[PDB]
Write a protein that binds this ligand. Structure first.
Ligand code: A1BAR
Ligand code: CL
Length: 167
């Protein structure tokens, strides 16, 4: 039993809600919140920009040190950093950005990172400003993640479409 509330159950392990991931994280304080990261951990907009803003830029400061030490992530890769005031940990996961011409096939690799964590709060990878089809992203998620994932979808109109179109 966990404290996630108001989610629709899609499968044995995948749950979904129309919610603001920042406000969700602040309420639940999950062990792991997933960030929709880029390889440079530059958290300028989208989910990443909002999460970083909620940490008062502490996420960006920590991320800049991580990149200075380790270099960029891979598309499809991830790193675990602090969750600051939002969660114990933040799993920064890089889904392909279609608006950069990145291979959408890497979306499955991106979701595989979730399997290293028993429970996660997350957005749909490569959705929003990363320019992928969110219906496809949900399909890959459900078909890739085996651990317990609580998906937050910011747009109420998009949420209703994902549910009503979910197979
Ligand atoms: C991932 C991308 C697509 C699906 C979904 C729609 O709103 N979305 C978000 N969901 C929840 N919280 C959010 N904060 C900032 C953005 C955001 C953004
Ligand atoms: Cl977005």
């Amino acid at each position: 039993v966990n404290s996630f509330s108001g989610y629709l159950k899609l499968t044995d392990n995948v749950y979904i809600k129309n919610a603001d991931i920042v406000e969700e994280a602040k309420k639940v304080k999950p062990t792991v919140v997933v960030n929709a990261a880029n390889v440079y951990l530059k958290h300028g907009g989208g989910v990443a920009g909002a999460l970083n803003k909620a940490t008062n830029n502490a996420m960006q400061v920590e991320s800049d040190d991580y990149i200075a030490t380790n270099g960029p992530l891979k598309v499809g890769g991830s790193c675990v950093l602090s969750g600051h005031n939002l969660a114990k940990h933040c799993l920064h996961v890089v889904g392909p950005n279609v608006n950069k011409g990145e291979d959408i096939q890497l979306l499955k690799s991106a979701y595989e990172n979730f399997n290293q964590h028993e429970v996660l709060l997350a957005p749909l990878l490569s959705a929003g400003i990363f320019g992928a089809d969110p219906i496809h992203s949900l399909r890959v998620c459900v078909d890739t993640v085996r651990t317990n994932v609580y998906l937050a979808v910011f747009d109420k109109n998009l949420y209703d479409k994902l549910v009503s179109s979910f197979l």
